Design a protein around this ligand. Structure first.
Ligand SMILES: COc1ccc([C@@H]2CNC(=O)C2)cc1OC1CCCC1
Ligand SMILES: COc1ccc([C@@H]2CNC(=O)C2)cc1OC1CCCC1
Ligand SMILES: COc1ccc([C@@H]2CNC(=O)C2)cc1OC1CCCC1
Ligand SMILES: COc1ccc([C@@H]2CNC(=O)C2)cc1OC1CCCC1
Ligand SMILES: [Zn+2]
Ligand SMILES: [Zn+2]
Ligand SMILES: [Zn+2]
Ligand SMILES: [Zn+2]
Ligand SMILES: [Zn+2]
Ligand SMILES: [Zn+2]
Ligand SMILES: [Zn+2]
Ligand SMILES: [Zn+2]
Lengths: 334, 329, 327, 334
């Protein structure tokens, strides 16, 4: 995109926007336009360089860029929510959560690499429909994964498979030991994004906040793998369910996108004479009531528990959530 | 009772048997279901549901399912191109020179084959899939990767819930249908164009017609060959359509080609031919496409059903001039 | 006929815990899974009940059996045949008499028949360490088990093979879910947590007035079915010594081959797979003590006292092997 | 790290057997027993060392052995004919044919590697039944490959797929251009092994013989890829059909195996109520007539043409073929 070794006017504007990668509330949609619809590539690249992950894991730059573009190319541009913009956002969000004071120096570079790589592939090749819809139509995807976390298993499978395309193996220089460890952590994290796992994921997290233990600096202390992976699973899970905690201006865009996607599934289900899934009926919808419900039963209980784990780090995020809830509350038409 | 969108749609569907159907218009009016609507319309028109005892619901379900597997984000190789090739083949099947030459099964094969010939097309060429070591290319050994895939997906989609539209055909019919469909779709791979055309010419030079001018086809070989070229012509019929339609196709294919070029540029790959938006020649390209591929093909087909395709050759030669006089200097 | 007079005679034990499966494999021409599944389907009148054409059932069974590897010493068609017949008997246990619908009975038996289809003779960890296509497809999670399910269902799609063609949509979805639930439960890594939940059920155990076990909701009925097939899969040590020793030789042969493969490859040799540092005897006793017995003891406490003659046979076979531990 | 790729205390007896690696009639069955059923791994290792392919293409020793073991592991031990022994034999036979005087210095190292690799993977994961059988039972395999060269397309896919297992990428150090060339040549060679392409192949070979050209040296002239790949295809095709041209003792063993595999398909076809395939009915078998017919209508016509192409290099191969043909003839019950 440059000319004579100097940034283009667009690149410069993009570079200036990217300066907020370490802040909750990055203008992720602005970055998607500026990057020519390459939010996931540019943001992952910026984060890998910010964290010096290329040197640490000897990842050639071109291989990194080639894989990222290939990964992004596999997110469907025609899907309203579960696309490359959602992935870029979950990546950036995870990146911010990883740098929380309460977790400073808690994770190794490899665990950090896993949290981020997992965030980047967690919804790749999402068809824009739920597991249940895939299950009810006897799709081969459902047949292949025995109707269990179909999409999630698929996202993982594809994320790894793309490492094999020409000059795409960003892990070519890791030892078998590192790769097996990285791989197990990424799998554990992504499978934990299947909402059907939510309740139990939160139950275990609350419990961890009970036996919780720290140091004289308030920094968390995680004994073994079981505790460290649990924090990472919930971290990415929070990032995936962070739309409601973002400045309303961003949140509203996420709401329109998820509803647009749900409504498309409802239309397809109606055409096919299937029962219209919950919240996927544009003729009997309550965008405001549903967002309030989403917040009261899932998002608030999750972030509240997280804010507790890293208290008081996630206070502003928690305040924003509660504020956005009241805003949606006051919007319900009587 | 009316419902406007319905009157305007059903009205447009009235041209289903005519070369020049306003397919883009039908796509809009049907809420983006041109393949479902047109296939179904055509299936009724030819009385196909009754002949092969295809339950309506199963057909509609399979059609929407198939249509759902064409990519909405692909400018050219999407559900609209599929619908067009289907309808274009439906017209070519009714040409006088072939009157009553094909059985109902063979008619079903040419149409189903047209419906799935490009399903799940990613918007990029075989060579791009090969050069990047895509899972698809490795699976098909770099040979007609996409075409093999289209077949595989088209058939596979029959196994989804209430999607087996051939559930009442016999093992004999299913076997015969499968083989014909496979032969037809694999023939759409452009790398096989030159040979297909040559082999077609040799057939015209043995054109064993009747007293009415109706072609004669004995063995499966002659038969399948006409079906392969028929579908091949349908697939390559954009230029022979009313200028207003042809122009939309041209804009669509270029959008897709340029998108591939941008992809290839991003990856540092050599930009494929006619895929560089910075070094384009839309007008010059189209003219060349017509002279070296489309016209040579259509002149041969019209030479097999003479004079059934005169208006087709005329519209072609006309658009050929329109784009030509559009060449800057 | 000179053969079936012997076979059919041997097949008269289908309902007894100790059938001579090996001899049956001989007499049937290495078709124990096809034969035994056939008998059991007639015995329970499953063909007429679900309107399964005879030709279709047999074609599928043969197709299914053909996908069990003849070169694998343990995880072959004989293990499959045996787990089927064993699940068959466990379903007739008094404490469960008339507790399961025919669909459920179908699911349990079908799940048993396909539970190990296309087993390569090596463990999930081996497929994982080698970056095999199977492990990459299933994200190193219950790799073999997911595969067994996929192939089992997939083979229904072959010529004249859909034995569930005449089931209603509801029956198909129900069966499908249950078969998956069962087979995924046979992954030994799920053992500990599957037994813990079985015991928690043994405590709050409740029966009907007729005595027969009272199975409330789906969660309770599937969990009982999961553990049942799991018991059938780990039944070898509870059978008569003669049979049991044949299984030990077979499992050890398969394990040693895997060990030899890991050695040629400079891979760490898996536990009990090193033929140069073997302990066939101590291992069977340890297998019986820390896994098999605890499982069959919790099952005894569930269908008490139905699983009595079996549990004693287990405790005896242990003594025998222990008396063979060198030192 | 052992001497012949695998460990064996019979190493001395194995070494003596492997001395004939460059000779037609190597005791392949004997080598299989001595290598612990690793004839493919041992023979490929020996050939790569002799041709110096590891050095030329920077193939790490351990990567090659791991791949060969993996590849050999995917030939089925329960299949009597299409197993690792047949693959080892075809590899070795192709190796001898590549060394024929009439072809000296004609092929590049890359083309030699392609011919040998293609021979090694040409029948991998063979089920022991024909393409026709897989097509008539609606096998998943036939569906994936639209009933066209089902087995052959699969042999190629598996052979290439296995390069992705841990430490199995023997082509990791080849440039992109080399990898594409090799891949195209291997695909072209293996697909030509489908017997349904036999007549076109032969007819084409005869044509080339008709206008055959030799250089200033006594070697064949091949300009374009088209003439080059054609010779390689016929060469491997000849190796695949070389059983009848080997010392009778070896030939008869091959005959028993193929018949055993054919009858197996025969029994399976009758169990399922299928029409038994030709030469698969153990109840109506004429093993001797069949071998004679096989030699008269397929093998001899092919080797006769190959002999002319490399005249007089394969004169003894042809002489043995005729001696063996008479042996089977005098074995025909009357
Ligand atoms: C901010 O919007 C949302 C953002 C993200 C999600 C996740 C994506 N898919 C899910 O099931 C949860 C749901 C949302 O809203 C849903 C809750 C109520 C209606 C839709
Ligand atoms: C309407 O034009 C076109 C319409 C359709 C096609 C087919 C789609 N892919 C192919 O390879 C042929 C090409 C066209 O023109 C191309 C040739 C020159 C420029 C683009
Ligand atoms: C009859 O023996 C056995 C029978 C069955 C099994 C199951 C099959 N695969 C498993 O992982 C468990 C293990 C046996 O013995 C093993 C335990 C110690 C050595 C081998
Ligand atoms: C050693 O003989 C044979 C050796 C090799 C083959 C090839 C392997 N598979 C084929 O289809 C051909 C066939 C043989 O003989 C067959 C032809 C007549 C009877 C069997
Ligand atoms: Zn998701
Ligand atoms: Zn997500
Ligand atoms: Zn196409
Ligand atoms: Zn097309
Ligand atoms: Zn198992
Ligand atoms: Zn088992
Ligand atoms: Zn072959
Ligand atoms: Zn072969």
């Amino acid at each position: 995109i440059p000319r004579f070794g100097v940034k283009t006017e667009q690149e410069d504007v993009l570079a200036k926007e990217l300066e907020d990668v370490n802040k909750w509330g990055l203008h992720v949609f602005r970055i998607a336009e500026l990057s020519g619809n390459r939010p996931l590539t540019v943001i992952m690249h910026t984060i890998f360089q910010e964290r010096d992950l290329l040197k640490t894991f000897k990842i050639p730059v071109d291989t990194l860029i080639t894989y990222l573009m290939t990964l992004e190319d596999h997110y469907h541009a025609d899907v309203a929510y579960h696309n490359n913009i959602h992935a870029a956002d979950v990546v950036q969000s995870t990146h911010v959560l990883l740098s929380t004071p309460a977790l400073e120096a808690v994770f190794t570079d490899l665990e950090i690499l896993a949290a981020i790589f997992a965030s980047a592939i967690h919804d790749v090749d999402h068809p824009g429909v739920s597991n249940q819809f895939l299950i009810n139509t006897n799709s081969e995807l459902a047949l292949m994964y025995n109707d269990s976390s179909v999409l999630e298993n698929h996202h993982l499978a594809v994320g790894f498979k793309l490492l094999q395309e020409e000059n795409c193996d960003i892990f070519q220089n890791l030892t078998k030991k590192q790769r097996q460890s990285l791989r197990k952590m990424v799998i554990d994290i992504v499978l934990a994004t299947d909402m059907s796992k939510h309740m139990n994921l939160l139950a275990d997290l609350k419990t961890m906040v009970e036996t919780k233990k720290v140091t004289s600096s308030g920094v968390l202390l995680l004994d073994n793998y079981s505790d460290r992976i649990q924090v990472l699973q919930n971290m990415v899970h929070c990032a995936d369910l962070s739309n409601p905690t973002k400045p309303l201006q961003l949140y509203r865009q996420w709401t329109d996108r998820i509803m647009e996607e749900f409504f498309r599934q409802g239309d397809r289900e109606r055409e096919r004479g299937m029962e219209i899934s919950p919240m996927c009926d544009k003729h009997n919808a309550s965008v405001e009531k549903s967002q309030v419900g989403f917040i009261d039963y899932i998002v608030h209980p999750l972030w509240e528990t997280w804010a507790d784990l890293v208290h008081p780090d996630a206070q502003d995020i928690l305040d924003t959530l509660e504020d956005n809830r009241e805003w949606y509350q006051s919007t319900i038409p009587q």
